[PDB]
RNA sequence: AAACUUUCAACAACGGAUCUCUUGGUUCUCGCAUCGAUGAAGAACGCAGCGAAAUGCGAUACGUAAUGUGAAUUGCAGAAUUCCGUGAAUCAUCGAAUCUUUGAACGCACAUUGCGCCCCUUGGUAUUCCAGGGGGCAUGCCUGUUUGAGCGUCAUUU
RNA sequence: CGUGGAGGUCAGUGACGAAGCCUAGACCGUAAGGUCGGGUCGAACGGCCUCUAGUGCAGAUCUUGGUGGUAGUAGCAAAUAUUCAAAUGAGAACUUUGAAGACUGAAGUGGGGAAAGGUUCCACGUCAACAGCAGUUGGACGUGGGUUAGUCGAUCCUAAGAGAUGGGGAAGCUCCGUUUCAAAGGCCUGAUUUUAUGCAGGCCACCAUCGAAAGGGAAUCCGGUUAAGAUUCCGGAACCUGG
RNA sequence: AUAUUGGCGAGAGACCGAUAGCGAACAAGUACAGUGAUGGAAAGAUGAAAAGAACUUUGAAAAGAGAGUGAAAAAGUACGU
């Protein structure tokens, strides 16, 4: 699916905070919040070059 | 409730949430052939409605309770 | 004093329960629900909010009536009754 | 002078064989419906 | 139960004056008199005429409100209206 | 156990009303007894009997209204067919089939012909 | 020399990788056309002998009727089919009904389970009082009925 | 050289044990790797010729999950303060009762409400988790019980404010305005003396509705009663409103 | 004749195989967070069959040790490997 791993609200935390700059899930109250997203190396992210 | 039945001549019923005191008094009179002096009502926290129905001196709530069949 | 000392003053309500959608999004002073848009006749929905549409769309509830229409169509919206033809 | 910097649309004809079958079925159905006319 | 108004029940509701009855029936006075004679509607007298007529002592004709309500159903009234249209 | 619809349909309205009252009295007594006896399954059979009696009564009354209205132009909306809103708004067969006099004359004079290619 | 620190094997932990599964996903193809004032989608509250969810259902409440099949349901307490049958079943089908409070939501209000009006009927010491039951009372627009308004136009001496 | 899947083939391996994993054991290859024995295990899997790709990791302050050292270390030093005996209990510094010692010291560590919370209230049973020691205790867990009004509130009124209708804008979702440039609705009399079964004569002016449990406002007190109710129940004695 | 990531009903694949594949193989748009608009998880596998360990003994008890069921407890609901 061209939406798989892509329907997340995530942003990078920026530089200088001693963490990898990968976009991370916003919000709170669940384990998902703060987790890396969108990246082919992230669990639950997009695959590299998704099949068409 | 049974202490009320024995001592205060009061019958305790669970009634419909939509029923008012007029309907409660009329229904009790029709169903049990007794005179009703007063009806006090409350809504229990579980969402149901409880009625205290005080009968007149002519009738014995204990006898009516035995006739209904709970004692 | 924007943390705990002010948090000591959290007792009022901006939003109560909405009659139409039940989401506790009814703004008391604006008299409008920020989720479904009640009391506007139409339901509030936005194409930028695809996930929200998916949350509230048809089929997420009981479909008390709409779920029998396919069977009625398949039988051709017949009237009458089935006869006891045999056994 | 100037390049096409945006993303195209794609139409793929996976249904080529299915549509050939469908056209053949429709022609047979119409032949039966209007027989013996051409 | 809030306080009830003081001229709405009892004699005030039991009796209706002739002009009020004619207006309620939406007919003329001649039609009203004809209908009352045909149906046996007769004027009555409240025991408390001031209570029936808002403290007024002026001589008035009173009818039973239920009798006027019953008169409202007579098909002869529909016949009267048909005659008016024919005329 | 329970009541049977093919046996209820024989009774008159008065008999059905009496049996409904008897069933409701029985259900009230059984609800009293359930407070004491930890398990009482007759409650379900009595409830379903009440439902069946009410169903049969409603069938009789609706059928009486239908026979009262038979052939009338205007029927009660609950006696009218449900279908679909759009299906009820569609033209009837008659209205959809109406043609003009000119088109009817043309259709009579020059219908589509049945032919073939052989000779 | 013990203790301790470090290295390997065995057994035991910790943890849940690997492998093997899969009533799920995903993509392609084909066919069909069917929501709602006859009150929809959605929301709330309920309903089972023992049930908080899901599924079902609406005070006729895991359902009533009808039709088919033909002996189950099952986790326990339970229906017995007169066993040679208008008959079980959390079965299938589904054409007859029921469908609480709401919602475009429609007597008026609404964050109230708040406040009215009309009609019929019934019951209470009842011509006057009270209560219950049933049925109604939104807006725009169309056709038609009926009742009207305006020296707006006109007629009105055998 | 290795991996997932595809076509062909070896009439390939296999519950008499496939795959995987462990191994102080063995062999082949310069190597990527390959093969064999032993253990563990339980249902599938390989060699070769070809096809195909989401095909090989030490890093990316990489993602997700798991786990160490630090370390039984830092810390549990505010709230002056506890102690003796008995009961209960497998078990008592912490539960219960008694006895002592203290404290809050009426601007209370006392007794009530608004709001908020939602059963925390009461009883019985109970200690796996929680109350940062403990626990036989508990706002914990299991199971039941409990909230009674003509007079207390809401409900009624209007406040700041909000806001339809009539109109007018706006492509439109809707906007302006709160009484206007609206036919905005009630009431009295009649034999209106002839036209014979068709309502006549008069009177009066103003625009919804919402918005206060601290403003305005009809009317209830005392005594008693429960495990938990109370100006509401019981007894007695009153009052208000309408008819 | 054309379109169709919605709805209903079907058939398929050199696709993924539980950190993959839809966020969701499981009571998933759930639990939960936020005043609100919104944001949004984790979590599959005993065995052919519960045959889910009667009974004895130690312990206050949880449990232990025997005994037993099972092809196997080197399968004991902390369950395939
Ligand atoms: Zn809403």
Are residues F45 and F81 both part of a single domain?
Answer: no
CA–centroid distance, residue B44 to ligand 1 (Å) = 29
Nucleic strand H contact set for E 10-29 (CB, < 7 Å) = 10-12, 17-20, 22-23, 27-29
Instruction: Kindly state whether B22 is in contact with chain F, defined as any CB-CB distance less than 8 angstroms.
Output: no
Tokens of F17: 């009303």
- Between CA B61 and CA B3 the distance in angstroms is 11
Are residues F55 and F92 both part of a single domain?
Answer: no
CB C23 within 8 A of CB C32: no
Backbone dihedral region for residue E2 (phi beyond 0: left; psi -120 to 50: alpha; all else: beta): beta
Are residues F95 and F65 both part of a single domain?
Answer: no
Are residues F67 and F78 both part of a single domain?
Answer: no
* F114 contacts on D by Cβ (under 8 Å): 36-37
Q: CATH number for the domain including F108? A: 6.10.250.3450
Tokens of E63: 């009818």
Tokens of A23: 């976009």
Are residues F96 and F116 both part of a single domain?
Answer: yes
Tokens of B30: 């029709």
Q: String of b and e for A11-31 (b: at least 16 CB within 10 Å)?
A: eeeeeeeeeeebbbbeeeeee
Which positions ≥6 away from C24 have C-beta within 8 Å? C15, C16, C17, C18
Q: Any known ligand binding at C33?
A: yes
Q: Is the CB of A41 under 7 A from strand I?
A: no
Which positions ≥6 away from B55 have C-beta within 8 Å? B9, B10, B11, B34, B35, B36, B37, B61, B64
- Between CA B11 and CA B55 the distance in angstroms is 8
* C79 contacts on F by Cβ (under 8 Å): 81
Residue range of the domain that includes F40 = 1-73
**D neighbours by CB contacts (3+ pairs under 8 Å):** F
Q: Alpha carbon of F102 to those of F67, F99, F107: distances in Å?
A: 43, 8, 9
Report CA A1 to chain centroid distance, whole Å: 17
- Between CA F45 and CA B64 the distance in angstroms is 27
B-F contacts (CB, under 8 Å)? 8
Q: How was this structure determined?
A: cryo-EM
* Three-class DSSP category at A11: strand
Q: What φ, ψ does residue A3 adopt, rounded to 5°?
A: -95, -10
Are residues F8 and F37 both part of a single domain?
Answer: yes
- Between CA F96 and CA B46 the distance in angstroms is 59
Are residues F81 and F56 both part of a single domain?
Answer: no
What number of other Cβ atoms are within 10 A of residue B5's Cβ? 19
Closest CA–CA distance from residue F77 to any residue of chain B (Å): 29
Are residues F11 and F62 both part of a single domain?
Answer: yes
- Between CA B69 and CA A1 the distance in angstroms is 67
Which positions ≥6 away from A28 have C-beta within 8 Å? none
Report cis status (omega within 30 of 0) of the bond before C54. Answer: no
- Between CA F104 and CA E15 the distance in angstroms is 70
Backbone dihedral region for residue F111 (phi beyond 0: left; psi -120 to 50: alpha; all else: beta): beta
* F116 contacts on D by Cβ (under 8 Å): 36-37
- Between CA E70 and CA E77 the distance in angstroms is 12
Are residues F40 and F78 both part of a single domain?
Answer: no
Are residues F57 and F113 both part of a single domain?
Answer: no
**At which residue do the structure tokens 């997009």 appear?**
A46
Which positions ≥6 away from F84 have C-beta within 8 Å? C69, C77
* Beta-sheet pairing, E62-64 with E15-17: antiparallel
Q: SS3 helix, strand, coil % of chain E, rounded to 5?
A: 55, 10, 40
CB C26 within 8 A of CB C41: no
F27-CA/G66-C1' distance, Å: 26
Are residues F69 and F84 both part of a single domain?
Answer: no
Are residues F29 and F5 both part of a single domain?
Answer: yes
DSSP string, C36-79: T-TTSSSPP--TT-HHHHHHHSTTSS--TTGGGHHHHHHTTS--
For B19, what's the count of Cα atoms within 13 Å in the CB-facing half-sphere?
20
Task: Please state the domain count of chain F.
Answer: 2
Q: Using the 3D structure, point to which of F73, F90, F107 is the last residue of a domain.
A: F73
């Amino acid at each position: 699916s061209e939406k798989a791993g892509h329907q997340t609200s995530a942003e990078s935390w920026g530089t200088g905070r001693a963490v990898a700059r990968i976009p991370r899930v916003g919000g709170g109250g669940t384990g998902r919040s703060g987790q890396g997203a969108f990246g082919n190396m992230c669990r639950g992210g997009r695959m590299f070059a998704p099949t068409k | 409730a049974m202490k009320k039945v024995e001592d205060g001549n009061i019958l305790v019923f669970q009634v419909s949430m939509k029923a008012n005191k007029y309907q409660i008094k009329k229904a009790v009179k029709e169903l049990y052939e007794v005179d009703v002096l007063k009806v006090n009502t409350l809504v229990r926290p579980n969402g149901t409605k409880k009625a205290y129905v005080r009968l007149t001196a002519d009738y014995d709530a204990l006898d009516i309770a035995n006739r209904i069949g709970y004692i | 004093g924007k943390g705990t000392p002010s948090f000591g003053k959290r007792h009022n309500k901006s939003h109560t329960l909405c009659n139409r959608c039940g989401r506790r999004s009814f703004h008391v002073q604006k008299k409008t629900c920020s989720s479904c848009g009640y009391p506007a006749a139409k339901t509030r929905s936005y194409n930028w909010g695809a996930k929200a549409k998916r949350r509230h769309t048809t089929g997420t509830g009981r479909m008390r009536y709409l779920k029998h229409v396919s069977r009625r169509f398949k039988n051709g919206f017949q009237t009458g009754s089935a006869s006891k033809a045999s056994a | 002078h100037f390049r096409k910097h945006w993303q195209e649309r794609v139409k793929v004809h996976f249904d080529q064989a299915g549509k050939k079958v469908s056209r053949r079925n429709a022609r047979a159905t119409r032949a039966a419906k209007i027989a013996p006319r051409p | 139960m809030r306080i009830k108004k003081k001229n709405t029940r009892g004699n005030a509701r039991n009796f209706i004056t002739r002009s009020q009855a004619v207006r309620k029936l939406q007919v003329s006075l001649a039609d009203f008199r004809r209908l009352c004679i045909f149906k046996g509607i007769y004027p009555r007298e409240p025991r408390n005429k001031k209570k029936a007529n808002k403290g007024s002592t002026a001589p008035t004709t009173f009818y039973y409100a239920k009798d006027i309500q019953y008169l409202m159903h007579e098909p002869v009234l529909a016949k009267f209206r048909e005659h008016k249209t024919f005329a | 156990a329970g009541v049977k619809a093919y046996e209820l349909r024989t009774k008159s309205k008065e008999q059905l009303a009496s049996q409904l009252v008897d069933l409701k009295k029985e259900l009230a007594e059984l609800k009293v007894q359930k407070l004491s006896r930890p398990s009482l399954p007759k409650i379900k059979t009595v409830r379903k009997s009440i439902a069946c009696v009410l169903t049969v009564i409603n069938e009789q009354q609706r059928e009486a209204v239908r026979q009262l209205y038979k052939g009338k132009k205007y029927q009660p909306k609950d006696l009218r067919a449900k279908k679909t809103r759009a299906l009820r708004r569609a033209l009837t067969k008659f209205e959809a089939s109406q043609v003009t006099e000119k088109q009817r004359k043309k259709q009579i004079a020059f219908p589509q012909r049945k032919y073939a290619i052989k000779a």
